[PDB]
Amino acid sequence: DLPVLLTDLKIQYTKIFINNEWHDSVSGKKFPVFNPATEEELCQVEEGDKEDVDKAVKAARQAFQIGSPWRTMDASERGRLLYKLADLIERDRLLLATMESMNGGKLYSNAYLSDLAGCIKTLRYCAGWADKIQGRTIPIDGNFFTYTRHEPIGVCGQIIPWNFPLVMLIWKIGPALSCGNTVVVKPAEQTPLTALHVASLIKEAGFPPGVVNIVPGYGPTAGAAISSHMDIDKVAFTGSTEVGKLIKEAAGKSNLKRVTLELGGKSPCIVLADADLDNAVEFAHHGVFYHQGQCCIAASRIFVEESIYDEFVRRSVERAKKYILGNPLTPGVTQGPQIDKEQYDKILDLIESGKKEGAKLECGGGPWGNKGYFVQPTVFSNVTDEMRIAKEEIFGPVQQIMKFKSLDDVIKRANNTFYGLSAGVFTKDIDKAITISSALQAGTVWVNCYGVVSAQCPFGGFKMSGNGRELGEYGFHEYTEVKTVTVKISQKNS
Amino acid sequence: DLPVLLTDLKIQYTKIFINNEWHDSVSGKKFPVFNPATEEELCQVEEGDKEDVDKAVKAARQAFQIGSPWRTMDASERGRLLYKLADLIERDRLLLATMESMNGGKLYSNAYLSDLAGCIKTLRYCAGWADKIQGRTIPIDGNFFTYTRHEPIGVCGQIIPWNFPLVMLIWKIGPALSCGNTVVVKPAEQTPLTALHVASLIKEAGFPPGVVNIVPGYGPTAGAAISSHMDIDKVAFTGSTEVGKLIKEAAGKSNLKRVTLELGGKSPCIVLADADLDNAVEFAHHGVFYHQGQCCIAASRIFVEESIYDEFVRRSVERAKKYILGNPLTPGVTQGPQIDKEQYDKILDLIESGKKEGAKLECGGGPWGNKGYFVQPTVFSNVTDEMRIAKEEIFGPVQQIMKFKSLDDVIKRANNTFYGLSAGVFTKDIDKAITISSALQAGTVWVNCYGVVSAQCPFGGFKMSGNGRELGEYGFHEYTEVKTVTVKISQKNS
Amino acid sequence: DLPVLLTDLKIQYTKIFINNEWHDSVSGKKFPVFNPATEEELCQVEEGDKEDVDKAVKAARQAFQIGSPWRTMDASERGRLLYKLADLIERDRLLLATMESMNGGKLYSNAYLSDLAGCIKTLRYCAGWADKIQGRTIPIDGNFFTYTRHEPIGVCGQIIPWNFPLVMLIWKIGPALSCGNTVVVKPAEQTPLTALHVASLIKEAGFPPGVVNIVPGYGPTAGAAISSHMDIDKVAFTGSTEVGKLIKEAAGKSNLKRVTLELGGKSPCIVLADADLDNAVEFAHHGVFYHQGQCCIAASRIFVEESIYDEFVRRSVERAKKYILGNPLTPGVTQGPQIDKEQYDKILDLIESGKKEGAKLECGGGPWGNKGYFVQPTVFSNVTDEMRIAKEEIFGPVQQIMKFKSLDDVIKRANNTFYGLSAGVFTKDIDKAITISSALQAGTVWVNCYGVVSAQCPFGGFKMSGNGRELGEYGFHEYTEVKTVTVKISQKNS
Amino acid sequence: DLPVLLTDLKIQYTKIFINNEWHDSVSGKKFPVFNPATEEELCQVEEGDKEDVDKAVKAARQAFQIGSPWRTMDASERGRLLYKLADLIERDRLLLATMESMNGGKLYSNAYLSDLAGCIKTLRYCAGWADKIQGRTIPIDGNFFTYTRHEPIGVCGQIIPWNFPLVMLIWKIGPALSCGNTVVVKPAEQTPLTALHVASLIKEAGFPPGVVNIVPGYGPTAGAAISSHMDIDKVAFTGSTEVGKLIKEAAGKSNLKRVTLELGGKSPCIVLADADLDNAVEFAHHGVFYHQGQCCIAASRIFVEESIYDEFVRRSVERAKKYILGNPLTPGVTQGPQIDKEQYDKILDLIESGKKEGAKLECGGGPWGNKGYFVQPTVFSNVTDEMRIAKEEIFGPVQQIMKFKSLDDVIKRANNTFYGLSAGVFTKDIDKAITISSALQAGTVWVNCYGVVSAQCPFGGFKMSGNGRELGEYGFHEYTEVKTVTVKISQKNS
Ligand SMILES: NC(=O)C1=CN([C@@H]2O[C@H](COP(=O)(O)OP(=O)(O)OC[C@H]3O[C@@H](n4cnc5c(N)ncnc54)[C@H](O)[C@@H]3O)[C@@H](O)[C@H]2O)C=CC1
Ligand SMILES: [Cl-]
Ligand SMILES: [Cl-]
Ligand SMILES: [Cl-]
Ligand SMILES: [Cl-]
Ligand SMILES: [Cl-]
Ligand SMILES: [Cl-]
Ligand SMILES: [Cl-]
Ligand SMILES: [Cl-]
Ligand SMILES: [Cl-]
Ligand SMILES: [Cl-]
Ligand SMILES: [Cl-]
Ligand SMILES: [Cl-]
Ligand SMILES: [Cl-]
Ligand SMILES: [Cl-]
Ligand SMILES: [Cl-]
Ligand SMILES: [Cl-]
Ligand SMILES: [Cl-]
Ligand SMILES: [Cl-]
Ligand SMILES: [Cl-]
Ligand SMILES: [Cl-]
Ligand SMILES: [Yb+3]
Ligand SMILES: [Yb+3]
Ligand SMILES: [Yb+3]
Ligand SMILES: [Yb+3]
Ligand SMILES: [Yb+3]
Ligand SMILES: [Yb+3]
Ligand SMILES: [Yb+3]
Ligand SMILES: [Yb+3]
Questions:
Q1: What residues form the catalytic site here (chains A, B, C, D) (predicted)?
Q2: Looking at A262, A362, A393, A478, which residue is catalytic?
Q3: Three-class SS of residue D277?
């Protein structure tokens, strides 16, 4: 039961989306969109720049004004709309999963069974919170009545990467809209198409115009205009550390807008001697190779206790030699290409660093094919902590395996990184599971599993892996602004 | 560092406490209080009855009126007072721990190091919640402003047992007072003395008069008047199942007052083959014998996997043969007497049932001494589920050990009881710890420990072990009444 | 836009619903169902009794067992099912609103626009909470890891009245199912039909069998079997004070099951001189007359400041003389009949008490028509606090108006009642709105409105109007059982 | 009852506080501290710079390591320590209030009755939250057990201004320490003395060494080292907008540390025709003049409805002509000096702008005295929105009064500012109170009062008045880092 589109994908939505209207770029400029598997242009899309961002902000601001339909409508009706949007995405699931695969280099079975399901589930999750966002009444000192309103912040700019275009769009807009904000979204330039399809469903669902505005285009242009905008109240971002820095600096220099960032990881696994070995090998393998390694949570440092290290490495190699590379639309294909040249170049450079720095190559180590940005799935053993491949996020299908004998020592090595997005602990010992997970400086710690992510759980980094949490009860906080209202009364009673 | 009173205990507070005044009984009647270790009368105390309860209710109601000092004072000042009460109990810790030991038959080192510390810590815990009890603001449908006040309920009657006189007093009054209620407390007739000492500290701390009223006396008289009172808003009770039934019936027949009950247990432990055996033997042993078995959470059914059953039983017997019986005030003494004749008679009867029903006696089985209600610490092995000693709460120093070989089967046996107060799981397997604890129908489940109780955790039964939770964030709910206030406005905004 | 059924209502579902199966009664007995507007039998329905209740409990218990589909399914999938049930009720909205009108004596426009909309909205609300019900992790003293699971309680029996058959069914099952409980519902004998239609939609939606069981029949028979059942964990009830007492007594005598009750009110309004007079007259009028006065929150004592009292009474009379009595299915009809003989007899008796006790009759005072249990809308002025019509819940179209001159005095009169379900305050003074609403002993206080009830707000009584809250964040608490899990660890860290 | 020090203040604590040790500066450099009332040096204090900050960070980091006393101690014991610190500050209240007055230019009666009381109350408030900071257990999709730990972040740098030296120290360290963080505090260079006294009490209370480190010194040196530190996890700051920008930029460039800022305001009051005029005049007057206008929440734009504008201005002038300037230690003195030259120069410049720009001078307008940075209390009427005195935070005793006739218009004018810290609404109309307060873009809105600030309420800005909230339940969030722990299990049950 993996259904496909029974007819070919026609691209339809290629324009800037503002006030539920399709707009050309102010400049009239357009930019190409490619398929990473063939390197062939799929279509051209309107190139948004500062002007267009200003128009989206004006629209978003107007939709947020006191008295507008989006401010005055029932919170439950905000939730009603998100739920309807989820039904619509469910309706065009074949279409959207195909678009995502073709534009994103993303295996179609994953796109359909995982990304699409996740979008749908996350929207329904966010829909449910709308009329459950609540302030407090507070027994303040003195004769006063004090309450708080957890209001929407206002206009939220949301800058989205290319690895999970749809999932990231929903993670950004679900919470924001549930809380009553308005949004200006900038998709990755590589991957605007699915966002614009969803924009058509936003209109069809009946969101008031200006509540969601989507401005495709480039980072230093559209992206920067957002980060430096004097009338955007908050910017949320997932992507590189470099750009994260640029965003915070821009925000600080302009209007001190709120910022929340999700950036790299170099997430470690710790595998103890008593671990279920096959379970640990399987989760860690998928933990690093998922979506061609193009995952913020990629399990890119795997520490295995010496007595099981050789066995662990052997079975990891076996598992990795089993992939089929090719077009992510063809059933049976189990590894697509990397998103683009730059990522491809970075991965190969880093692989080359691994060889030169004296890591042990178990398989892969080079590119594949005549077309597309394919990289062989690659495994390194005997990796040490000073190697580039141990320190830097690779974002490619490249796994690092490394041995330890001292538990104290491996916790410190696991934490000796400016990243801290997630980690994995594999053991049958209760005390070790609890104590190790407490001691890892990482936003999500999985025990005897890896890459388990759901709408009900907050997600975010420690340290330079970012700030703030997305999703879960806790994530909803980052899309509200608390206002305290305190009223003089003649006499208070408990 | 176990300090003692350097001079003999003089009893001073022997009267009914209402409106911060010491009152004689309306009847003029008094009743004896005894020391369970010597069977000798310590003093006489004013016998409260219906009349006196009516006076306490009138006082409590007046103190709760809108505009009174207790309703209008800052919530933080309610907390200030509880904290001061805790300082005072800390000041008279030697006095109070000695009184508790002498009146309660309670080992003095436990009284000092545990009961007193617990009272003090729980008061400070409850103090901290006072100005953190909060309502909500709610995004209701339509043009309205809606908030909730989590108000105190009103006059709470609180009926207290004899096993932990002081601890139970603090568990009842800490939460109730933090939430702004007023209370009418009825101590166990066996153990009024420590409650009345604390009453003097309530006055010294400066609680408004009528906020705490203490009416010593008997159950069918004072107790029943509370349960059937038409102006008491809530009754809380810890004690027997029988009386729990009487209370609920009385409440239903009178004014449908809120009721929360903590009643027996027949709490099971499940010890798996892989358990740390000594750890499990030690916690389970203390789990059943603590305070002469006079604990609601007594670990009175211990299921041990067959392959470690004989070993478990052997070491449990060793551990139990090591006690020293005698006066709980004398250092070195490690087991005091039972509270009174009735409890003593019940324990011996049940021991006799165990012998007649064909359980295996490993040690004890009879009374001890010429004076005091002492029972030898007693262990039974080969106990089956149909035996009285397997089914009924003993509330004496009597341990039941029982074997299993099928994990499915033992979970069902562990749950095949109308009680459900707590349980213990002993294992090194993570999955078993989590899955077993989920499947036990019990309010508290300890893993690789037992009898761990703290102010930060809610505590209460499943099934006929009672209803409601005490302590923790969650317990505070049972001492508030939610009022929804909904105000028409011209236009709402998110 | 008030659409109707374009074809006549065929009754189809007339049987006991257990394990998603339609069952005959064990006895083979059936009972008539009538239309209160014509006094004519609509159909016959299987009469459930103790036996049938036992079968529903066995089914509900089996569906709740550890490992069953309802325990193991994702919480979000529980929510998915409630949302689907809401879509289905939306699909059969014409059918269900017509059935409700014909069986319940309920105005069809209200049934369609209000009851049906409320059911649908409340289900969607409850759906949203399913995967947002959360426990805690707790910084307990000592080296332990402590968490809580907010588990479903288990088998919940739910006894439902006839005034809002559908709304009450949804209020009971929405929260219960969202929290993962299983239910045994007993509809009012007068009004089983809509519950059984919904049961067919429960099957169609795909709830696991045994999760919802509906047992139509009579109170002393089916109802009592529930209240006294040894394997039902909680009973929830809306109805009379008398039966509420019977339920609590039954629960206390049997297995100490949890009980939550919603019972009468004699809800007061206080209208100050500065009130918007027309607004206050309009809300108070609808507050008392809604659904032929057959509302728990009926505004059955209206206190008006002397200087505006005569004016208030005059305009209230005008408003009340405007009704059209008749069949609730016919457009234009603005007052249907009372549910049945007993209610009719009670209303007329109480009207007669009002005349004999010297209250002033402004209009009505007698029955209407040749068929159906119609009572003229009736207004009394100069009512005093000792009159039966001031003290007792009438549950008929009978309004009491009463004057005050002293604000202190009227708050005490408003509170001088064993009821406390709701109240209304009408004023333009901020301080008075806040202080008066704080001082009224009532679960919901409306300011400058009345009868505003939504899914986002908890709802329940003070005093003998019941215990517990339904709906809102807070109401969900009453459908969970908290279990504390505390695990020994070697060393804890903050 | 305003007691004083019965002997002269001896300055004792003048050094850098690290690991509970008093340190000289690495450079050996010291800097003068002055009394703003006399312009005379009080003493010299060790000048902390980058080196010293590095030492404090190393100490704070070590104290935060897994396994340290501050990580492993009971949460309730963290709370115990804060409560003890509060007792100690209460003990040295005369000393501390005098030091604060003499160093801060702060009226002694305010220092004693307000600042000191606030510190003490806020510490006790923060103490109470320690063991009530809780994570969640979460019904995630799939067979997993998921919980969250709300952990301390780590090393928090805290940069403090001179207007409320003590209050700001407690607002920063109370929450941070309650949540289990360690701190590096940099006092205002003008006002280090009271922070260092408190440091001695931190030692006396028994906080583990390295938990609180205080590094007096200058902003571009000590301050910047904090903001740019690669091992500080979070920086909190109260002060200028300029420095706020510098901090965020520094944080973004270095290690992307979390940042929370409280910056200026230009907080508006809106006074409607129906307002209680005297109440509004009194609160607004104190709202702007408190502590010589050196308050972030200064009510520096007062919009009054035309029909009451002249009256409002007249009575405001009367109230302002009543002050006595002089040394803040002398009883009867009702206005002290400004903190220093720079602030003095800024205030006078802005006053001069007001005159040149054509605002109407009602009183004041110039400096006062031969010594000290005194400015006459100054009132301007007929102020327009384009004037410097309407746009810029003055931070001096300078009040702006301004008329409106259109309610829509005044809400927009009130919001037409990049600030948004607080606002005041004065009216007897319920609907206006609620709707206006909702529509103002400000973190705290007072109704019929002003400057009401308590520990139980969160406090923070909208827009460029900052980000994050301090105090209240909500403020505690900004001092925790959420970690999600997700464990694979064989089968989950609800
Ligand atoms: N709070 C509310 O919404 C309601 C209040 N009432 C009050 O009660 C008065 C009498 O009306 P009734 O129809 O008699 O309400 P009731 O309390 O007699 O009936 C309501 C439900 O309770 C059940 N019941 C009856 N006897 C029972 C028993 N022995 N054990 C368990 N369940 C039993 C009924 O079958 C029905 O399902 C009304 O005049 C009104 O004042 C009645 C219905 C709803
Ligand atoms: Cl395996
Ligand atoms: Cl790039
Ligand atoms: Cl090519
Ligand atoms: Cl969380
Ligand atoms: Cl051991
Ligand atoms: Cl007894
Ligand atoms: Cl007895
Ligand atoms: Cl004897
Ligand atoms: Cl809890
Ligand atoms: Cl509750
Ligand atoms: Cl009107
Ligand atoms: Cl009846
Ligand atoms: Cl009846
Ligand atoms: Cl007839
Ligand atoms: Cl609530
Ligand atoms: Cl006044
Ligand atoms: Cl400066
Ligand atoms: Cl000079
Ligand atoms: Cl809040
Ligand atoms: Cl937050
Ligand atoms: Yb880039
Ligand atoms: Yb190529
Ligand atoms: Yb008894
Ligand atoms: Yb004897
Ligand atoms: Yb009845
Ligand atoms: Yb008739
Ligand atoms: Yb500066
Ligand atoms: Yb000078």
A1: 262
A2: A262
A3: helix
DSSP state of C217: B
Give DSSP secondary structure letters for D56-106: HHHHHHHHHSTTSHHHHS-HHHHHHHHHHHHHHHHHTHHHHHHHHHHHHT-
Helix axes A430-439, B430-439, angle to 10 degrees: 100
* Cα nearest neighbour of A67 on chain D: D439
In 3-state terms chain B splits into helix, strand, coil percentages (rounded to 5) of 40, 20, 35
- Structure token pair of residue B36: 């369970």
CA geometry: angle D91, D92, D97, nearest 5 deg: 130
Q: Which ligand is nearest to the CA of A369?
A: 23
Beta bridge partners of D182: D155
The residue assigned the tokens 């702006």 is: D400
**Tokens found for residue C221:** 């028979």
Please count the CA atoms within 13 angstroms of the CA of D223 that sit on its side-chain side: 21
- Is C217 touching ligand 1 by the criterion CB < 6 Å? no
Instruction: Looking at the structure, tell me whether residues B286 and B303 fall in a common domain.
Output: yes
Q: Which of C141, C147, C427 sits opposite D137 (nearest CB)?
A: C147
Tell me if residue A311 is catalytic.
no
**Can you give the C-alpha Rg of chain A in angstroms?**
23
Is residue B486 less than 8 Å (CB to CB) from chain A?
A: no
The dihedrals phi and psi of A112, each to the nearest 5 degrees, come to -65, -55
The alpha carbon of residue A110 is apart from the nearest alpha carbon of chain C, in Å, by 21
Residue among B66, B76, B135 whose CB faces A137 most closely: B135
Contact of D436 with D270, CB cutoff 8 Å: yes
Which residues in chain A have Cβ-Cβ distances shorter than 8 Å to C493? Answer: 438-439
Task: Name the residues of B annotated as catalytic.
Answer: 262
Domain that holds residue D222: 1-264+455-494
Task: Say if CB B62 and CB B210 are below 8 A apart.
Answer: yes
Which residues have C-beta within 8 Å of that of residue C28, sequence separation ≥ 6?
none
In this structure, what token pair is assigned to residue B296?
Answer: 């609601």
Kindly give the interhelix angle for D75-91 and D117-129, rounded to the nearest 10 degrees. Answer: 170
Domain check: are A296 and A373 in the same one? yes
* A-C contacts at Cβ under 8 angstroms: 71
Cα distance between residue B288 and residue B393, in whole Å: 11
**In the numeric block, which tokens belong to residue A262?**
């999700």
Token reading at B41: 């009368």
- CA dist D15 and D13 (Å) reads 6
Domain match, D167 and D42 both: yes
Same structural domain, A335 and A384: yes
CA distances from B56 to B151, B156, B157 (A): 21, 11, 10
Say whether both C151 and C204 belong to one domain: yes
Contact D449 A144 (CB under 8 A): yes
Q: Residue A312's domain is classified under what CATH number?
A: 3.40.309.10
What tokens does C250 get? Answer: 């039954």
Residue owning tokens 């709460």: B393
Q: How many domains does chain A have?
A: 2
**Distances from the Cα of D455 to the Cα of D56, D167, D185, D262, angstroms:** 28, 11, 20, 16
In CATH, what number is assigned to the domain containing residue B228? Answer: 3.40.605.10
CA distance A203 to D474: 35
Residues C448, C480, single domain; the answer is: no
* Separation in Å, CA A322 to CA A107, A316, A317, A318: 16, 10, 9, 7
Q: What are C72's two structure tokens?
A: 């193991």
CA A154 to chain centre: 22
Q: Which of A354, A414, A346, A352 is nearest to A381 (CA)?
A: A354
Quote the CA–CA distance of D67 and D60 in Å, as a whole number. Answer: 14
| C11 Cα distance to chain centroid | 24
Does residue B235 share a domain with residue B211?
A: yes
Query: Among all residues of chain B, which has the CA nearest to that of C475?
Result: B482
Helical residues (DSSP H) of A294-339, grouped into ranges: 309-320
Is there a single domain that holds both residue D392 and residue D350? yes
